[PDB]
Design a protein around this ligand. Structure first.
Ligand SMILES: CCCOC(=O)N1c2cc(CNC)ccc2[C@H](NC(=O)C(=O)Nc2ccc(Cl)c(F)c2)[C@H]1CNC(=N)N
Ligand SMILES: *[C@@H]1O[C@H](CO)[C@@H](O)[C@H](O)[C@H]1NC(C)=O
Ligand SMILES: *[C@@H]1O[C@H](CO)[C@@H](O)[C@H](O)[C@H]1NC(C)=O
Ligand SMILES: *[C@@H]1O[C@H](CO)[C@@H](O)[C@H](O)[C@H]1NC(C)=O
Ligand SMILES: *[C@@H]1O[C@H](CO)[C@@H](O)[C@H](O)[C@H]1NC(C)=O
Ligand SMILES: *[C@@H]1O[C@H](CO)[C@@H](O)[C@H](O)[C@H]1NC(C)=O
Ligand SMILES: *[C@@H]1O[C@H](CO)[C@@H](O)[C@H](O)[C@H]1NC(C)=O
Ligand SMILES: *[C@@H]1O[C@H](CO)[C@@H](O)[C@H](O)[C@H]1NC(C)=O
Length: 335
C-alpha cells in the first residue's frame, strides 16, 4: 500500500556484496523491536497478491545488478559488456519495514496456509530477517514451519499454479566443486529425504485423497528449472534432481525410486557460464569458475512443485517472487 524500507545487520567493512548493497540501501536493525499481539482481530491475508513480494523482488534485482555483473548481458537484440570480477557472495538476512504511519501485520497461526482469514494477528515494524536466496526446485536457507508441513498454492485445482511446500524439518544438502573444472556434486542423506517425502506425500494426500501420489523429475524447459539451480559463492550450479524427485506414495507409505549409494543421494552438478536470467527474459555470461573447493552447506526448507487415479508432482521454479512469497506469506502492510 506504500513503499517499505529495509533493515539489515550488514557491515560496510565486509566486502561481501550483500553487505555492501545493504550498507548502501538499508538502515540498521532495531536492537529490540516492538510487537503487538491481537488474538481477537482476525484479518485476511493473501500471500499470492502481496505488494511486499514486488518490493523485495525489485530490491534483489538491484542487489544482483550491483553485485553479480555479467561479463555480457543479452537482452532482446542488445548486448551489454562490463567488468565481471569474481566477488565474495553469501546472502545475509534482510528485514522489510513499514515506514512511519504504516504497520506490518503478522499472522501468528502456525498452520496458516497463506490465504484467507487468520485469527491470531500481531503488529510489527519489520518482518523477520529473510535471506534472499535465488534458486529453483528447492528453497534453501529459509525458516521452517513450526508445526506441520504446510502446502501453499494460489489454486490447488489449477495445475498451472506453483505449489510451495513449507517443511517443518530441514534437510541438509551439501554441494561441492572439489579442488573437469565445471563438474560438481551434491549429497543428501537419503534417510531424511525419505522421511520428508513420506510426510509431504501425506499432506498432498489430504489435498488429493483418492489418488496415488508420485514424485518425478522436471519434464522440460531451460536448464535453470529442469535442474536445481542456485548460486554458491558466486558460481552458478545446476544440479540434476532426477534421483531426488523420484518416488511413490501409495497406501500411506512412501517408496523412493531414485538411486542412492551408501544411503546418500548424490546429484551431478555443472557450473555454468551462460545463464538464463531470472530478472528478465535474457541471457547473461560470466567468467569461468574460481579455483579451490567451492562448497555450500545449505538447509532445504521448502520445495516448489507443479502437478500434471494418480497425481504426479514435479520440481518447479523460475519466478523468484515465489521464493520471496515462501517467506513473506504471513505478512501484510496496513493503514
Ligand atoms: C519476467 C520476469 C520473471 O521471470 C520469470 O518468471 N521466469 C520464468 C517463469 C517460469 C514459469 N514458472 C513461474 C519458468 C521459468 C522462468 C525464467 N526463470 C529463469 O530463467 C531462472 O530462474 N534462471 C536462474 C538463474 C540463476 C539462478 Cl542461481 C537460478 F536459480 C535461476 C524466468 C524468465 N527469464 C528468462 N526466460 N531468461
Ligand atoms: C487455504 O485456506 C483457505 C481457507 O483459509 C482455503 O479456502 C484454501 O482452499 C486453502 N488452500 C490450500 C492450498 O490449502
Ligand atoms: C511435520 O509435519 C508432518 C506432516 O504435516 C508431521 O507428520 C510430522 O510429525 C511433523 N514433524 C515435526 C518434526 O514437527
Ligand atoms: C481454481 O481452479 C479452477 C481453475 O482450473 C477454477 O475452478 C477456479 O479458478 C479455482 N477454483 C477454486 C475452487 O478456487
Ligand atoms: C539428469 O540425469 C538423467 C540421467 O542421469 C538424464 O536422463 C537427464 O536428462 C538429466 N537432466 C538434466 C536436465 O541434465
Ligand atoms: C529414478 O531413478 C532411476 C535410476 O536412478 C531412473 O532409471 C529413473 O528413470 C528415475 N525415475 C524417473 C521417473 O525418471
Ligand atoms: C530411506 O532411506 C534409507 C537409506 O538408504 C533406506 O534404508 C530406507 O529403506 C529408505 N526408505 C524408503 C525408501 O522408504
Ligand atoms: C545457506 O547458509 C549457509 C550458512 O550461512 C551457507 O554456508 C550456504 O552457502 C547457504 N546456501 C546458499 C545456497 O546460499
Amino acid at each position: 500500500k506504500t513503499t517499505l524500507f529495509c533493515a539489515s545487520d550488514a557491515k560496510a567493512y565486509e566486502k561481501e556484496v550483500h553487505n555492501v548493497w545493504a550498507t548502501h540501501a538499508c538502515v540498521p536493525t532495531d536492537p529490540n523491536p516492538q510487537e503487538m499481539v491481537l488474538a481477537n482481530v482476525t484479518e485476511n491475508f493473501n500471500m499470492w497478491k502481496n505488494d511486499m513480494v514486488e518490493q523485495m523482488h525489485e530490491d534483489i534485482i538491484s542487489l544482483w545488478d550491483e553485485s553479480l555483473k555479467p561479463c555480457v548481458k543479452l537482452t532482446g537484440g542488445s548486448a551489454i559488456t562490463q567488468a565481471c570480477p569474481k566477488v565474495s557472495f553469501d546472502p545475509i538476512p534482510l528485514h522489510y519495514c513499514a515506514p512511519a504511519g504504516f504497520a506490518i501485520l503478522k499472522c501468528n497461526n502456525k498452520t496458516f496456509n497463506g490465504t484467507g482469514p487468520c485469527r491470531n494477528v500481531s503488529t510489527v515494524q519489520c518482518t523477520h530477517g529473510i535471506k534472499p536466496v535465488v534458486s529453483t526446485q528447492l528453497l534453501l536457507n529459509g525458516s521452517l514451519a513450526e508445526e506441520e508441513i504446510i502446502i501453499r498454492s494460489e489454486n490447488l485445482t489449477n495445475n498451472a499454479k506453483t505449489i510451495i511446500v513449507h517443511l517443518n524439518e530441514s534437510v541438509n544438502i551439501v554441494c561441492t566443486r572439489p579442488n573437469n573444472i565445471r563438474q560438481a556434486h551434491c549429497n543428501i542423506n537419503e534417510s531424511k529425504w525419505n522421511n520428508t517425502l513420506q510426510k509431504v506425500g501425506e499432506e498432498l494426500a489430504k489435498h488429493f485423497p483418492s489418488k496415488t501420489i508420485k514424485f518425478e523429475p522436471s519434464s522440460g524447459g531451460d536448464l535453470e528449472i529442469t535442474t536445481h539451480s542456485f548460486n554458491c559463492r558466486g558460481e552458478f550450479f545446476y544440479c540434476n534432481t532426477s534421483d531426488l524427485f523420484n518416488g511413490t506414495y501409495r497406501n500411506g507409505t512412501y517408496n523412493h525410486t531414485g538411486r542412492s549409494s551408501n544411503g546418500t543421494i548424490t546429484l551431478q552438478c555443472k557450473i555454468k557460464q551462460i545463464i538464463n536470467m531470472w530478472q528478465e527474459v535474457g541471457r547473461a555470461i560470466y567468467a569461468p569458475p574460481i579455483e579451490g573447493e567451492i562448497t555450500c552447506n545449505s538447509n532445504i526448507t521448502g520445495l516448489l512443485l507443479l502437478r500434471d487415479d494418480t497425481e504426479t508432482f514435479r520440481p518447479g521454479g523460475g519466478d523468484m517472487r515465489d521464493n520471496w512469497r515462501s517467506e513473506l506469506y504471513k505478512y501484510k502492510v496496513v493503514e
